[PDB]
Antibody
């Protein structure tokens, strides 16, 4: 029942130090486990970063060893990653993960302690950039006769002009999931992102339900809850 | 090659069987693991210890290995098996760092084609009162994943202020895209209409909105 959740800064300045934390739930950091980090540059494959056990023992990717420190916090049930002297090559989604106790060397007494990462976090997006963070401006996309087709109506939220990625959108604090489509962001000529999230709902529910989009832009520590109401007027 | 390698792409027909193979010196004497990843999602372990399925992974996934190669087999492939598949090992060298294969992107053939669903939103009252105006053209559920988008002001083409995304893979393996037209509030309010025209495999869907 172990679950993992990353937190990160969003933006890190070039030559700066990236700091990430992974919160462990459903199990103890002090149990025999290899608490691990993996990353994935945009459009590219997976790269293992390293692992730590509760006693402090570590193993790191040799290509990153000189810049990586993984740590454990017993009391808070977390582990963390520090990556120094960052460059654009470190822009990536960073995952924390769990690997059970393993033994893969030929010297191992047993052969059945396989190495694998069975539990993964959601990932946190890290952008290495000298540009300034910018929070979004959120506008409602109201349902109307022209955004309705028969028994189904579309309504949404426009999330304008933010940096860096990502923005996450939920609806009704997570109580509305059916019919939700959050579209990938456009990267504008300005270097800022915009995206939209739309939900399709029964057209007969437009008067009787409340629709609120919850926009989270963690890089700028901004959250916006935007009410989306039918046009009228 | 000594390095951990797999072909970057392979295709399989719906309901057929496909073998994804990884090759490298680190697989010798090693019990490999395999990870499935879909766009916008974290990897999922599908095989560990050469041939073991985690709970919840369907039995059409299996694993095998011999010598310097390891294979993931999908028997009776379903549409939801479209994904990137990575093998994983630990090197015999040093203190045994973890290595991933480059990934094999599996395409499942025979999935249904579809014309795009297009929804066009006008600028919101709030945005107009903030002295800006954006039209939002949302394009979804099209397959294959290629589209072109054009905008009209009344009956005339407008290309200033257009920004359009590349298509992105949806969870149902169809594709989505969006196009935005930036205008001034005075341009929006003084026109008869604006239109978003979406072309997909030779056919076109156009939606129109008008100020009111």
């Amino acid at each position: 029942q172990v679950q993992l959740q990353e937190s990160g800064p969003g933006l890190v300045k070039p030559s700066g130090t990236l700091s990430l934390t992974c919160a462990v739930s459903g199990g103890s950091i002090s149990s025999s486990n290899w608490w691990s980090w993996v990353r994935q540059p945009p459009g590219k494959g997976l790269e293992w970063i390293g692992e730590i056990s509760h006693g402090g023992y570590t193993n790191y990717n040799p290509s990153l060893k000189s810049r990586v420190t993984i740590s454990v916090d017993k009391s808070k049930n977390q582990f963390s990653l520090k990556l120094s002297s960052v460059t654009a090559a470190d822009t990536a989604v960073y995952y924390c993960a769990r690997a059970p106790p393993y033994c893969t060397s030929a010297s191992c007494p047993d052969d059945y302690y396989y190495y694998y990462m069975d539990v993964w976090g959601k990932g946190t997006t890290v952008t290495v950039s000298g540009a300034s963070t910018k929070g979004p401006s959120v506008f409602p996309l109201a349902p109307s006769s022209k955004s309705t087709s028969g028994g189904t109506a579309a309504l949404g939220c426009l999330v304008k002009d933010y940096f860096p990625e990502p923005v996450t959108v939920s609806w009704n604090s997570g109580a509305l999931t059916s019919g939700v489509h959050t579209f990938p962001a456009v990267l504008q000529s300005s270097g800022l992102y915009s995206l939209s999230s739309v939900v399709t709902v029964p057209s007969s529910s437009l008067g009787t339900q409340t629709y609120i989009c919850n926009v989270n832009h963690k890089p700028s520590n901004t959250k916006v809850d935007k009410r989306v109401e039918p046009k009228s007027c | 090659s000594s390095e951990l390698t797999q072909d970057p792409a392979v295709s399989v027909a719906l309901g057929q069987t496909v073998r994804i193979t990884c090759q490298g010196d680190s697989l010798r004497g090693y019990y490999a693991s395999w990870y499935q990843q879909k766009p916008g999602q974290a990897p999922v372990l599908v095989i560990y210890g050469k041939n073991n399925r985690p709970s919840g992974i369907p039995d059409r996934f299996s694993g095998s290995s011999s010598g310097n190669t390891a294979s993931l087999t999908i028997t009776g492939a379903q549409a939801e098996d479209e994904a990137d598949y990575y093998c994983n090992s630990r090197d015999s060298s040093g203190n045994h760092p973890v290595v991933f294969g480059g990934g094999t992107k599996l395409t499942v053939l025979g999935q249904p084609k579809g014309a795009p669903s297009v929804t066009l939103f006008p600028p919101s009252s709030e945005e107009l009162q903030a002295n800006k105006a954006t039209l939002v053209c949302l394009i979804s559920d099209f397959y294959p994943g290629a589209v072109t988008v054009a905008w009209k002001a009344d009956s005339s083409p407008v290309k200033a202020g257009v920004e359009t995304t590349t298509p992105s893979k949806q969870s149902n393996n169809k594709y989505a895209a969006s196009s935005y037209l930036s205008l001034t509030p005075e341009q929006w309010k003084s026109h008869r209409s604006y239109s978003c025209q979406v072309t997909h495999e030779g056919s076109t869907v156009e939606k129109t909105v008008a100020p009111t």
